[PDB]
Write a protein that binds this ligand. Structure first.
Ligand SMILES: O=[N+]([O-])c1ccc2[nH]ccc2c1
Ligand SMILES: [Ca+2]
Lengths: 364, 361
């Protein structure tokens, strides 16, 4: 195995395939698989749950073969070499020699044949969409995912195909985000759970260009192709809860207000909320919202804002972090809060589009 | 106590005074007197006093409030906001637009004041010079060493120069700058936390700093801020005895090439104690590293060197720290032998000097 590649054709690929890898439980898991074959260097990183594969074309002399070497050491070497460096690599038994200028690096190898390999699987649904759509879908809901919950499925993100739409759902038990976006193709109905780390990789591989995303989904896997990267993840086995089941029945009490005015008042109020419980109270009345927080020292914050509202007056408490998370993920001009009563969750949406909705439970 | 003041005029004062365990140490002392608002923060070891002018109706008085909360509130208000503040028994009410806040207070009397003391040594210098002096040597301070007197920086006055020296027993940094004033010869040790805070009040503009040094205290005045720190009470080593007495072997090298070769080679050094071996020979330097994996790095660099060949190891971070402090075209390394420390300087300046012990590999 031999190749010589210019630094910058190696770097971005090396970073992408390092993404699944911290502290490797076993040595081979900290390695990348390098393969030269029919004119192409493939780089593969895995954590056993997912794989990221990069392909780099080789325009300079090369010879086939395969080995594995430490991912971070090799990345840091290529990164630290000077701009435009030629990186000449050759497998030499138990070492892989890397040379560039008068820099020389000897990396210890482990057999390519020992590198872990995701099992072959079959595609069942396929579609293409813009990267901006996939980014939109993920950033809309990602924050609502659970973090290291014993209920393993909540640590992921639900991906769901219905009619002409791709949808994401995330929840942690206390709050929910769902976001549907259309993609100009009719589709079958699959409902799959992507693991937290896969959602991060998916996001990581969107460059913000005009290469579209090809998605493939099987019973137990998901694959995304962007440009010269192929990301494949095992799917999480479980039942994600049902979003239709938890949206509010009849929240015909509608408050409309500026997203940023609301965010900043909630932000200011939160400063004097309970440090642990983060509760604030909202008083709604004709065209007016009042937000108050207090903490056990009897410090108090009050914010008054003009809003659009015709309903009966009411009063309700929310965890201000959850509201702020929602308003931060909204990044729109106006928000719609759809209330029922002081003991019922609120549904929050961009006032100008129902493509996303958020459910937050009330607190006493 | 009541004042109404532009959010605009409180931001930078609050940022400065929220820099310096006990509960009232997390509070700010606010004082209105003679048409001025004074804000003070402290950690008992140092303090920062900021002053704001008050043109709008105001009432004299004083109290203390949670520093981070008062800061986050004022900062959280919208740009252009007016902030009306009034003391009201055991609470301070803050108001702006239709936002209202009541913060808990502690009595202004209970707020600690650093004991009064007397100035013995005084001088003015540009902010820029003080920043250069601190930047040159800051990284060589000890962090949490039993030898308390290394956990900080020597400020020395000699001739018409201010000098800083810092060291952790393994590497040492010295920098001197002329301030155009005849000074008595005098040495004090500023605690590192004090050095860090002094640096953060230096915005890098045109503005002289005024320094006042007491037997146990240092004070700096710039603009509308007054920073005061206690000194550290011990015996700082003498940089003159640390400089190698005749480092006869002199090598010059490109700063950045040296740095990148050090940084790259270190990738394959020991993760816990990162060191590289240097083999100096006729106009050539080779840097090598090894690790328990039996992995090896080698960099060869063109350098300027004639004189006896030798192999000597160095700690990577000590050298990198020096080369980053230097940020110049070429560095000179003045070597003695394989067992002795080395002196490093900017090849085109003696303003600063670094001494680094060798590492056995
Ligand atoms: O680098 N040195 O050789 C060095 C640094 C600090 C020191 N303090 C006392 C001796 C000494 C030496
Ligand atoms: Ca109010």
């Amino acid at each position: 195995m031999k190749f010589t590649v210019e630094r910058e054709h190696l770097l971005k690929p090396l970073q992408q395939v390092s993404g699944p890898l911290g502290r490797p439980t076993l040595p081979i898991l900290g390695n990348l698989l390098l393969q030269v074959a029919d004119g192409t260097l493939s780089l593969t990183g895995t954590d056993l749950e997912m794989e990221m594969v990069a392909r780099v074309a080789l325009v300079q002399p090369h010879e086939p073969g395969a080995t594995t070497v430490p991912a971070r050491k090799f990345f840091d070497i290529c990164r630290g070499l000077p701009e435009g460096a030629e990186i000449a690599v050759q497998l030499e038994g138990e070492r892989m020699l890397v040379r560039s200028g008068r820099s020389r690096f000897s990396l210890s190898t482990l057999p390519a044949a020992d590198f872990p390999n995701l099992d072959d699987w079959q595609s069942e649904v396929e579609f293409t969409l813009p990267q901006a759509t996939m980014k939109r879908l993920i950033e809309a809901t990602q924050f609502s995912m659970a973090h290291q919950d014993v209920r393993y499925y909540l640590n992921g993100m639900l991906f769901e195909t219905e009619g002409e739409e791709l949808r994401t759902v995330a929840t942690d038990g206390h709050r929910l985000a769902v976001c549907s976006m259309p993609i100009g193709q009719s589709l079958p109905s699959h409902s799959v759970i992507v693991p937290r780390k896969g959602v991060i990789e998916l996001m990581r591989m969107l460059d913000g260009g005009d290469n579209p995303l090809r998605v493939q989904i099987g019973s137990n896997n998901i694959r995304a192709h962007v440009g010269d990267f192929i990301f494949t993840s095992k799917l999480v086995d479980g039942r994600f809860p049902d979003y239709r089941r938890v949206l509010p029945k009849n929240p015909d009490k509608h408050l409309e207000a500026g997203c940023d005015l609301l965010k900043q008042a909630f932000a200011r109020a939160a400063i004097l909320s309970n440090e642990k419980f983060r509760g604030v109270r909202l008083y709604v009345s004709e065209n007016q919202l009042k937000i108050t927080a207090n903490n056990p020292e009897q410090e108090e914050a009050e914010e008054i804002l003009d809003v659009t509202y015709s309903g009966a007056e009411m009063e309700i408490g929310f965890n201000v972090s959850y509201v702020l998370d929602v308003l931060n993920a909204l990044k729109c001009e106006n928000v719609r809060m759809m209330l029922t009563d002081s003991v019922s969750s609120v549904q929050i949406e961009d006032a100008a589009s129902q493509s996303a909705a958020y459910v937050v439970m009330p607190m006493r």
